[PDB]
Structure formats: structure tokens, C-alpha cells
Write a protein that binds this DNA or RNA. Structure first.
Lengths: 80, 96, 497, 170, 76, 79
DNA sequence: GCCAAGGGGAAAACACCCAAGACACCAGGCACGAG
DNA sequence: CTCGTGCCTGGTGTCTTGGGTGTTTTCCCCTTGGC
């Protein structure tokens, strides 16, 4: 089934409820996917960028870690 | 009230020291593979990398919704409308 | 080492808070177990009868003339329904519309019926909702005067259209009165303190407005209450007792100086009833469209006003035998939040948490706060929310959305100092459910530890000493004996200081 | 149906585009098409727009790439009570499909529409409605030029007066 | 350039006092500060106007600046 | 008290420059507050870089670092 | 007398607040899907 | 294996625009005046 819907409206509705957002226009759910995709796209690009120096053809959490840093989304809970 | 619905959900707030991922892991993992595929083939995704993305995005989207809520609140609105997301993104300057 | 500044504020507070939790549950059980003997509120309704019998209905010229007619004395519209003079009480008409459709004028009358009576919780208002309903009526008449007519065909529609809006709004208004009018205790008087130096303030804008638009006036203290008299001669009276709180907002950092009145009962401004009232005046230029004398005049004018008000207060406090101490919001104890719809600085007072700068006014009488819950509190958030539980559970909780997390510890401390029990929760579950749940079965609720249900099981409450916890999936990080051995290559090279 | 047929058992009986999302005036309306006007049937009010009054028809792709704004320049403007609109603006999603039936003979449908359309059709409301109204009013569908922003949208994020909207470089 | 250079320099030396005496500034630094100062306020007002727009108003208010900085993450 | 010295028109002109149409008098109180908070951090950083350089008078080199370190970077200079 | 300049009055264009209502969102419920 | 995702319904509630204020500005009426 198409993974863009995999980020189902309830999956979104949960996040918005957690971001404190109360009522949600239908319209939001759609933009969320775009935003998320935009967000992920930047991240994945960078993960690949790191992966290429490592001469790898496997994506690791390290690449994501080294990436989230670069976007001001530093992440703890990975690595050695 | 000792009955179900009351006890668990009530206490789950306190049982929820857990950090359950809000997006379904496989539905998301498929999208990761999909967008990954959208970028390049041969990309093995370590579940760790999938988790890294998933957790970051969920908190991040919650973050986006924090701003979006503000902006709705800003406009004296409860329901967020995409204009709020946009406002938030524009102000954050977190735009491509 | 041992660089920590001092014991964390929470650890100090915890004993008192833990204490408060015990105190709360005992306190809650009696009050609530005692309260469980009280009971609910009843209501009544009537039918919208146009005329008691077919003979009492009018015989007005329009009816004869095949014209849509309005009987104002009976709040009824009379229309020729396929040659039948049929009445419809204005209370059945939702609204109207009219259209010119080339050579014709169409008057459309919409009526209340299932699905059309939108927005009201009174879905199926009708004494028999399964009955079929006349949803709407549309009449047409040509825009052109036909031979022999006393009025253009469309002229009848244009006048019926106009007059319906008139009678309808008049009816809606008289109806709205009864909704706002009921639930008000007759105030006995005010008793003006005749021939006495009654303290007064004159640069005062009342809030909300009495009439459609704002007015200035002056506030005076009398024998048993205040009076605000508009510059247009309107009199507004406030018994001192009926004031739940008098809170004074100095214009410090605010473009207005304000006296906020939170009332024990709502009072009518004619237009509406309000439990909250304000008197204030503008500090300066609020509408600049894109210097010491001006700036200094601001400093003077503020001080001048600030003093005049401060004097009025003291004069009133003295006059009132202090029964009306003007609480001044402790500004450094205020924090950013949203109790209604917009972000404002909430501020505590000696007995309330409020924000009177903005409108509508926000006032929390801490005496009524049963408990506080900090929902959404989590490390990744940047903001959080606060919920207020009232002592009368029949009344809804209040949220104070998106409060910034930087205020987390300071707010708890303020709450602590107020003897207010609070709890944190990353989740934000349904309070309406939780209220009915506990309203229906407080006994079993308290038996399940009652409000302890919110406890995040921080410290060793024996009742649930082990909470719902289990080992995650680890051997509590223990570095294996072989991992330490690489340390010898910390080669002693005395690299220059 | 039971009541409708019972009425019809004594009764003596152009088309309605149902559930149209209008931004101007704001609301959902049913367009009862007529020979010279469209009777924009609403939930309280209704209006008839003689096709002669339409100055222009515009099809504006929303920057979201998911909706389209259809615009009808009105002259005269409809008098919404005291307020008056020089435009009719419709908002429809690119995937908001519908079906339309003309209470006309296929000879008449062919006669007036040169075989560009049929008495019965189904498809995207925006494409379909643009074509149907293009005929009743004869105005050509106005569309943006090769203007597509850095963000790709055929319009620009802006503000005019006390509000925000889209500026379209036609 | 929109602020008086004197009050601006006076303020710079004044706040410097709260951190450390002896501190004074070469003209290049104070100018560079004002150059930075103006850019920041410019950006903030633009952003605040976006809020003004977003709130359907033209008269900006402190809360507009607060929200903008709040969303901007200028605070701790 | 020199923050009071940051004239209302100076602020007002920047607001006009920022396309603001109208302003409420509180903006001045607020603007002064904002200006301080920005300045506090930039100078403290400027102070620290100068303190490291072992100097008591700040140079543009030092402020560039303080702003650059905060992402509030200046333009038009080189060396 | 013919021809022209000025102050003033009534109004228009704007940024903003208050009221109504309709749709569009969540809540409620029965069912299909794939983690 | 059965909890999670979803199609469908009603309601609201809450976002939109209409009605309205009074401020910043212009075009116009009124009247006196100069060649």
C-alpha cells in the first residue's frame, strides 16, 4: 500500500495532539506529508553524502547521527 | 471506577515512561525505503537508521506542531490551517 | 567535584508536595464523599403557536391581495400558500433570502427543521422531529408592475423580505434577553454615599461596553458598592460583596492601567451578562502610523495616573474597612500562556492567577483549584500545558496551553508556595471522561488511590512500589573485563604545555 | 423515494452541479444551470448569474498542486446583502471527481456544444466544470502563462490588505 | 543607520560595565555591532509583520515580536 | 540607562524599513528589551573572544566571531 | 463684471474590532487490513 | 491473531466573512477677492 498514506492521518493526528495542536484541518494532514518528506529528503541526502565518503552502500545510524547534527537536530541514543 | 478504559488508560500515562514511536514503524520504514529509493538504489537501511529517522521526525513534527499550535493560537484559532505550518516554517526559516 | 549548586528545588518541595498529596486525597475524599449527596438542575420549554384558532388569525389586505404578509402583534408571517392564507410564526423562520432572476423577484423563506437548525445542540428542536417539515418556501413575483396593481408584484416581496428581518431580529433579541436574564439574583441597591468625599477615578473605559461602542466614565465608591457613570449619563453599579476579587493592574509595561473585577455572579451590561469587568485608561500612543518631552510626559502621565489610581485604591480600601484589598499581580511571578485563545502573560495575585490585560479576562480563584496537571511535560517539548481541576467536579477543567517549558520549575514553585498540588504527565487524556468517571464512582476512584493515579511513581509509594516497570533489555551496562586492556598506549609523550 | 414517487404519482414534471465549494461567496452551493443563467443554489441564499454578466473565466492552479481555483469575473457583481462581489471564486481539488447529466436532448447537447461534450459525463469536477461553463458563457478558460515560481507554483505567496492570498502572474 | 551613535555607544560601554570595567570599544566594533543590530531588528520586524499579516492586522504588538522570537527560539 | 537613549524614531524608522505599517507604543518598551537581549549575548561573546585575545578594547575581528558564532554574521569584510 | 485662489465641510480608503454561520474536524461506530 | 486503520455518520465549533468604528486623506462647496 502506498507509504505516503503509511503516515496515516491518525499517525499525524497523534503527533499534532502531542505538539499540543487541538483541532486539525484535513488540509494539514497532506502538508504534513510534504513537510515530512521535505524534512526526510534533506536528511536522507545528507546520510547518503556521509555514506559516500565511507565508500559504503549501506546506510548506518552514524550517517543519520552525523546528519541530524548538521541540521540542528542532534540526536542521542546511537553509536558506541 | 475500577473498570477497564479507566484503569489502564489512566495509569498508562504513568506506565508510559516508554517512548513509543507514534508513526507505525513498518508503514514508516517502507516510506524510508521509498524516499531512499527516490534518491538512490542499493541503499541498505539499518533498522537503527530507520529508528533514528523515525524518532527524529516524530519529535520534529511534534516540534512543528508546537509552532503551528502557537501560530493558530496567534491567529485566535484553535484549528491549525496549513497557513500556520507555513507561517511557522517561514519564521523558523527552515525552508528549502 | 560536588559542584551542584544546591538541592534541587523539587527535592525541597517534594516533601511538602508529597505531604500535599496525602492531604489532598484525605481532603478530597471527605469533601467529595460529602458532596455526593447533592443533585442536578431541571428545565422547561413551550410551543411557538401563531394563533389559537383560525378566527383569531388576521384578514389583512395583503392576505386578500395574494401578498406575503407579516403580523407583528402575533410574531407571525401570513403567506398565500397556493391560494391558502397560511400563517407561520416568525420563530419557525430561520432566515430569508431574495433573488432577481431576470424578469422576476424571488423571495426565499428558510425555516427551522432537522438538519437546517444547524449549530444548536438542540438537534431536533421540534416537539415531533420525525414529522415531515416545511424546509423552505420560495415565492416569485415579477419586478415589473402589472396592470391595475396597487403595488409591484416584487414590491410585496421586497417589503415582506424587509419586515421579516425586522420582526425576526426583534424576536431573536427578546428571546436572547430571556437567555441572558435568567440566572440573576435581584441586587438590593447600592446606596450612594451622599455628601461625602467619595473616592473617584475619571479616565476610565469600561469593559465590556454597555452600548454597541465604548464610553468613558468615572468610578466612585459608595456605601455598599461602586458606581461607574459614563460620559453619556449611563449608571453602572457594583455591590462590594458581589466582587469575587478586585485586582489592580498598574500600567507597568502595559499600555493601560486597569482595575479588574472578577465577580461572584455575572451582571448585565444590558447587552450581555459578565462575571468580569474592567476600568482602564490608555497610557499612550497605541496607533502610531509609520523626544524627551513626549517620553517624559509618558513617565509623568504614568506616574500621575498610577498615583491617582493607587490613591483611589487606598481611599477605597480605607472606606471598605479593607474588605476589598486590591490584589496586584506579582509580575515577576507571571508566565506566558493561553487560557482561552491568544498568548498572554498570566500573573498570580495573592489569591488568584489571572491575565486582565487582554480580553476576555482570565481569572482563576486558587481557592477553587482542586489540583493542577502539567500535561505534555516532556524533555523534547519546548512548551507544555497546564490543567486546573476544580473542587466542584461538575465543572470543566481549564487548560493553559503552550506554556513554555522554561517556566516549568518556577511555576511549580509558585504553585508550591500556594499550597497547590500539581502533577506532570506527558500524555493528555480526556478530562470530560475522567470527570464523569470520578463523578459517577468517586468511592471506587478514591479506593484506587484516587488522584494518586496521576503520580508518575517517582518515589517508593508502597501501595504500587514497583509501579508497572520491568527490566528493559540490558544487563545494567557492565563493561566486560576484556574491554579495559587497550589503555596502556596512553604514551607518556610530554607534549609542550 | 417512497414519498417522491407518491408525489410524482400525481405530479406534472437544466442540470445541477451539486456540492460546489465556493470561496466567493463563501459556502457550498448547488449550481442549477439554466438556459441563460446559473442559479447558484445555497443553504440560505441563492443567486442567478446571467451568463451575459461574466467578463472572464480563469483557471488558477493552486500552489499546493492539489487544488484549483476557478474564477468568474462578474459584471455586475452579485449584491450579497450590502456587500457586492466582482468575482465568483470556486475552489475544487484536482481529484474531486463528479458526474453531470443535462436535462437536454443529445441533439441539443451536440447542437450547442459541437461534440466537445456529451449529455452525460463524469470526471474531475475542475476540468468538467471548466468545460461545461465555458459553453454556457462562451468565455475561454483563462490560464496562467509559463509563470511557475522558484517554488514551482503558478502564483506567489503574498498579502494584500488585512489578509494573505495568492498573486497569480497570468 | 537609524539610531543615534552616542546613546548606542553609551549603552555598549554601560552593559560592558556589568561584565567588566576597563572595557571600551574601537569604532570598528561599535559600528559592526550597530550594523548587526539593525539587521536583527529588521529581520524581526519583517517576521513580526508576517505575524501581523497572519493575525489579520497591520498594527504590530509586542506579542507579535514575542511569538516571532518564541518561534524563532531566541530564548533559552 | 542608555537603552532609553535608543530613540523611538530610530526604532520607528527600522520598523518602517521592515515594512511594518503601524506600531503600538509598547513596541518601544519591547524593542528596547529585545535590543538588550541580543546585545547581552553578542557582547558577552565579543568580550570573551577579546578576553581570550588578551585585549581590553574590542575590534571588528572579535565581533565578527561573536556574531558568526551565533549565526548572526556580518558582511563586507576580509583579511 | 469676469475670472480666479483660498479656507473649510463632507466625505472616502484604510487598519482594525465585534457577530453569525456553515463546513469540516473530531467523536462514534462497524468493518477490513496487515503488522 | 487481533489491534490498527478506515469508511460512514452526526454534530460542533470554530474560521470565515458581514457589519461597523474612526482615523488619514482627498474632492467639493462656499465665499471673497484682483485685473
Amino acid at each position: 500500500r502506498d507509504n505516503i498514506q503509511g503516515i496515516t492521518k491518525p499517525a499525524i493526528r497523534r503527533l499534532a495532539r502531542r505538539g499540543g495542536v487541538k483541532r486539525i484541518s484535513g488540509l494539514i494532514y497532506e502538508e504534513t506529508r510534504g513537510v515530512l518528506k521535505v524534512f526526510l529528503e534533506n536528511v536522507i541526502r545528507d546520510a547518503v553524502t556521509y555514506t559516500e565518503h565511507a565508500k559504503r552502500k549501506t546506510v548506518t545510524a552514524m550517517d543519520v547521527v552525523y546528519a541530524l547534527k548538521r541540521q540542528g537536530r542532534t540526536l542521542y541514543g546511537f553509536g558506541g | 471506577r475500577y473498570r477497564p478504559g479507566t484503569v489502564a488508560l489512566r495509569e498508562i500515562r504513568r506506565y508510559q515512561k516508554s517512548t513509543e514511536l507514534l508513526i507505525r514503524k513498518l508503514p514508516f520504514q517502507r516510506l524510508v525505503r521509498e524516499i531512499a529509493q527516490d534518491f538512490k538504489t542499493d541503499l541498505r537501511f539499518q533498522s537503527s537508521a530507520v529508528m533514528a529517522l523515525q524518532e527524529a521526525s516524530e519529535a520534529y513534527l511534534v516540534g512543528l506542531f508546537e509552532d503551528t499550535n502557537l501560530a493558530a493560537i496567534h491567529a485566535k484559532r484553535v484549528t491549525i490551517m496549513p497557513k500556520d505550518i507555513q507561517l511557522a516554517r517561514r519564521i523558523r526559516g527552515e525552508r528549502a | 567535584e560536588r559542584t551542584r549548586n544546591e538541592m534541587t528545588a523539587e527535592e525541597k518541595r517534594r516533601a511538602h508536595q508529597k505531604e500535599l498529596a496525602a492531604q489532598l486525597n484525605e481532603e478530597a475524599k471527605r469533601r467529595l464523599t460529602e458532596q455526593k449527596g447533592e443533585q442536578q438542575i431541571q428545565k422547561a420549554r413551550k410551543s411557538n403557536v401563531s394563533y389559537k384558532n383560525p378566527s383569531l388569525m388576521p384578514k389583512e389586505p395583503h392576505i386578500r391581495e395574494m401578498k406575503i404578509y407579516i403580523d407583528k402583534k402575533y410574531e407571525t408571517v401570513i403567506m398565500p400558500v397556493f391560494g391558502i392564507a397560511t400563517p407561520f410564526h416568525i420563530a419557525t423562520i430561520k432566515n430569508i433570502s431574495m433573488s432577481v432572476e431576470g424578469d422576476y423577484t424571488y423571495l426565499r423563506i428558510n425555516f427551522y427543521c432537522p438538519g437546517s437548525a444547524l449549530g444548536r445542540n438542540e438537534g431536533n428542536i421540534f416537539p415531533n422531529p420525525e414529522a415531515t417539515f416545511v424546509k423552505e418556501i420560495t415565492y416569485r413575483a415579477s419586478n415589473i408592475k402589472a396592470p391595475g396593481e396597487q403595488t409591484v408584484p416584487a414590491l410585496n416581496l421586497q417589503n415582506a423580505f424587509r419586515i421579516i428581518k425586522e420582526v425576526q431580529k426583534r424576536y431573536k433579541t427578546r428571546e436572547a434577553e430571556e437567555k441572558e436574564k435568567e440566572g440573576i439574583v435581584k441586587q438590593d441597591s447600592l446606596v450612594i454615599n451622599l455628601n461625602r468625599s467619595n473616592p473617584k477615578l475619571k479616565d476610565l473605559y469600561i469593559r465590556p461596553n454597555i452600548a454597541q461602542k465604548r464610553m468613558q466614565g468615572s468610578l466612585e465608591a459608595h456605601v455598599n458598592g461602586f458606581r461607574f457613570t459614563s460620559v453619556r449619563g449611563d449608571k453602572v453599579d457594583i455591590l462590594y460583596n458581589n466582587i469575587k476579587h478586585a485586582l489592580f493592574q498598574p500600567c507597568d509595561g502595559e499600555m493601560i492601567i486597569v482595575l479588574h473585577f472578577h465577580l461572584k455572579n455575572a451582571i448585565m451590561f444590558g447587552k450581555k451578562r459578565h462575571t468580569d469587568v474592567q476600568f482602564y485608561t490608555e497610557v499612550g500612543e497605541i496607533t502610531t502610523d509609520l523626544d524627551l518631552y513626549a517620553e517624559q510626559m509618558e513617565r509623568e502621565m504614568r506616574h500621575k495616573l498610577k498615583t491617582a489610581f493607587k490613591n483611589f485604591i487606598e481611599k477605597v480600601e480605607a472606606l471598605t474597612k479593607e474588605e476589598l484589598e486590591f490584589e496586584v499581580p506579582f509580575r515577576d511571578l507571571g508566565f506566558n500562556g493561553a487560557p482561552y485563545r491568544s498568548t498572554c502573560l498570566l500573573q498570580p495575585t495573592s489569591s488568584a492567577l489571572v491575565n486582565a490585560t487582554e480580553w476576555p479576562p482570565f481569572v482563576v480563584t486558587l481557592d477553587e483549584v482542586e489540583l493542577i496537571h502539567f500535561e505534555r511535560v516532556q524533555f523534547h517539548l519546548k512548551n507544555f500545558d497546564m490543567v486546573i481541576v476544580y473542587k466542584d467536579y461538575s465543572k470543566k477543567v481549564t487548560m493553559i496551553n503552550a506554556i513554555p517549558v522554561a517556566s516549568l520549575d518556577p511555576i511549580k514553585e509558585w504553585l508550591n508556595s500556594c499550597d497547590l498540588k500539581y502533577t506532570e504527565g506527558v500524555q493528555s487524556l480526556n478530562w470530560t471522561k475522567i470527570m464523569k468517571t470520578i463523578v459517577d464512582d468517586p468511592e471506587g476512584f478514591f479506593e484506587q488511590g484516587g488522584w494518586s493515579f496521576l503520580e508518575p511513581e517517582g518515589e517508593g509509594s508502597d501501595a504500587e512500589e514497583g509501579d508497572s516497570e520491568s527490566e528493559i533489555e540490558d544487563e545494567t551496562f557492565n563493561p566486560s573485563e576484556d574491554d579495559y586492556e587497550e589503555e596502556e598506549e596512553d604514551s607518556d609523550e610530554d607534549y609542550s604545555s | 423515494e417512497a414519498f417522491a414517487q407518491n408525489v410524482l404519482s400525481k405530479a406534472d414534471v437544466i442540470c445541477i452541479f451539486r456540492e460546489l465549494q465556493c470561496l466567493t461567496p463563501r459556502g457550498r452551493y448547488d449550481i442549477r444551470i439554466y438556459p441563460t443563467f446559473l442559479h447558484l443554489h445555497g443553504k440560505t441564499f441563492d443567486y442567478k448569474i446571467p451568463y451575459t454578466t461574466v467578463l472572464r473565466l480563469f483557471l488558477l492552479p493552486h500552489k499546493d498542486q492539489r487544488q484549483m481555483f476557478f474564477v468568474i469575473s462578474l459584471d455586475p457583481p452579485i449584491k450579497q446583502g450590502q456587500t457586492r462581489y466582482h468575482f465568483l471564486i470556486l475552489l475544487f481539488s484536482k481529484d474531486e471527481d463528479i458526474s453531470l447529466t443535462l436535462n437536454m436532448n443529445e441533439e441539443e447537447v451536440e447542437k450547442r456544444f459541437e461534440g466537445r461534450l456529451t449529455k452525460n459525463m463524469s470526471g474531475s469536477l475542475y476540468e468538467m466544470v471548466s468545460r461545461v461553463m465555458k459553453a454556457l458563457v462562451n468565455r475561454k478558460i483563462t490560464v496562467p502563462g509559463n509563470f511557475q515560481g522558484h517554488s514551482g507554483a503558478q502564483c506567489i505567496t503574498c498579502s494584500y490588505k488585512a489578509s494573505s492570498g495568492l498573486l497569480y502572474p497570468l
